[PDB]
């Protein structure tokens, strides 16, 4: 009923152990220390590109809520077609 809280630096929420797990699934044995920031950079770019289009869909639909379909249509536009969330 009042206001929200400030959102800042949440790319650090994608921790070093969370990045390690994704490397293991990708079949990675040794992980350089510089990698953890380079991955955070690359993830931020990916998320920006997807959310930008998802939100462009939401705005076109005259909505305030970004639906699962908007994220799905955004992914198909990026050529990272996702199965399982509708469409």
């Amino acid at each position: 009923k009042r206001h929200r809280k400030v959102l800042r630096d949440n790319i650090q929420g994608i921790t070093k152990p969370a990045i390690r797990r994704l490397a293991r699934r990708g079949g990675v044995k040794r992980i350089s220390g510089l990698i953890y920031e380079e991955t955070r950079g690359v993830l931020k770019v990916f998320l920006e590109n997807v959310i930008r289009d998802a939100v462009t869909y939401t705005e076109h639909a005259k909505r305030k809520t970004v639906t699962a379909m908007d994220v799905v249509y955004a992914l198909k536009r990026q050529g990272r077609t996702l199965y399982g969330f509708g469409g």
Partner: peptide
């Protein structure tokens, strides 16, 4: 902006699947 619970999960799946493939 508001986010459907599912839309966030759709984003998370997409991200991890991408990053694992990038790895």
């Amino acid at each position: 902006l508001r986010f459907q619970s599912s839309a966030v999960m759709a984003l998370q799946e997409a991200c991890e699947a991408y990053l694992v493939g990038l790895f």
